[PDB]
Each structure stands twice: as structure tokens, then as C-alpha cells.
Ligand binder design. Sequence first.
Ligand code: HKC
Length: 269
Amino acid sequence: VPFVEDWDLVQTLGEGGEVQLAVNRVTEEAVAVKIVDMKNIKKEICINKMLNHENVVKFYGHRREGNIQYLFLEYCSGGELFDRIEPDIGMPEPDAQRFFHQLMAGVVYLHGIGITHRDIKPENLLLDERDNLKISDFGLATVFRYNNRERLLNKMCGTLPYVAPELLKRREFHAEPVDVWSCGIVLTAMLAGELPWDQPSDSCQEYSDWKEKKTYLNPWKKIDSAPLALLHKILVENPSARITIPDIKKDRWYNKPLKKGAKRPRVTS
Ligand SMILES: COc1cc2c(cc1OC)-c1[nH]nc(-c3ccc(-c4nnn[nH]4)cc3)c1C2
């Protein structure tokens, strides 16, 4: 079948290099192509070849043309989770619970194969055509468990409003509680439409107020008591005392019926 390998770079999806929407000449299948001008990528492609989950962006393959590296990834027509968050409002609680369930499935998977994303935020959480959440960008990702032996991290990685406090106060820390904390900050953004603090440090007043349990303040005043009880368990300063994903899965709000299924077409009489 001729021309089946030809893709047209239709439009820009993002920057950093750049991400382009690529449409197949013959089949018209859409993919996102990451254009990386090498003048790191070996690890990124290596981690991407291990990934196969419904809540993780699909890696179709890579092609290298001199100094330009082309990463062929999943096109997600729902765009970014970031653009579903209304500033200072957020989104309806049932939508946030469904996206948080899908985010947990994706992070469970990753941790299961010993991968830590290290930069979970709404900019990196993409939505497919049926609004299924997908974890994207393994540029900062790394192997924290190999041959069933855990390796402690020491490197500063992430985005300050989403990083766990141990990453700023300890030399070494465990990988999994760091991804749990960023998921908790994502849940806060989804239910309040604002970030609670610039960084989880004691010099940050908003962060001190949260440790002082001043929940009558923003963003916590906008969040219902059931998801707020969960956030109280996730945004715990001590990474050893922090809730683990198996226990998030037992939380009362996480298992609270709120959301209806996708609305299938119906007729009466
Ligand atoms: C602003 O609107 C969009 C923005 C994006 C997509 C779709 C969009 O609208 C439908 C889309 N589909 N897939 C991606 C995507 C996939 C993977 C990666 C990635 N980065 N590093 N590794 N994988 C980046 C973007 C994007 C961005």
C-alpha cells in the first residue's frame, strides 16, 4: 500500500521543542508528533517503549533524522485537563472524581512497573475523544524500582506548586509519595480552580495555614468536606504518614457515587 507512511504536519499542539498534530496521507489517522532538536531522549524513548495502559499516552514509535528526533505519540482530541479547570471555580465534583479515578489507574500502573512520572500537573494530563484522562510526557520520568529493589531519589524534578515538601527539605526521598502529593494538588486545582501555594515550604503562609488546618480559607473553603477529608490525607507533610494509593481507593469520597455514565442516545413511547 503506497504513501501509508506519509504524515502531514497539520497544526501546533504545544511547545517546550514542539508538538505537532500529524494526519496520515492515506488513512487520515491523527497522531501527535514531538519534534526534539537534540542540539536524556534515550531514556525518554526507553521509558515510553515500556508503557501500555488505557490512562497513559500511547507511544507508536520514534524516527531520527540527523539532529531532529521525531516521537510519534497519541493524539488526544479532548486536549488538556488544564483547559477543563475554570479559574477560581474548577469543575463539577462528579467530573473531578472520574478524572481523579483515571489518574489513580494510570499512576497505579506506572508505579507497578517501577516508573515515576515526577511532573504530574493538569498541563500533562490529556483527554481522548470520550474524555478519558491520559498521563503524558516522560521527559522527567525515571525507574525507581528495578529487580524488585527500590532506589531512593535525590534529584529536584517537577513544578514547584505540585512538588511534595520532602523534595525541598530532604536529600533522599521515596518516589511513590511524591506522585501522590502532585495528584492531590491536581485534585485541589480541579475542585477549587486555584493552586493552594507557590511551593510546600514553611516560608509560604498558605502552606503554614494548611498545616494549621485553617480550612475556612481559600482554596479549601470551596471544597466539600468528603473530598477535603481525602486532601487532608494526601497533603500530609511526612511522606511516611501520607496516604498510599491502595488506601486512596478505600477513601469514602473516592467510592462516593456522584457521576452518571456517558449519555447514550434514547427515545420514548
Ligand atoms: C491545546 O489543544 C491540544 C493540545 C494537545 C493535544 C490536543 C489538543 O487539542 C485537541 C494533544 N494530543 N496529544 C498531545 C501530546 C501527546 C504527547 C506529548 C508528549 N510530550 N512528551 N512526551 N509526550 C505531548 C502532547 C497533545 C497536546
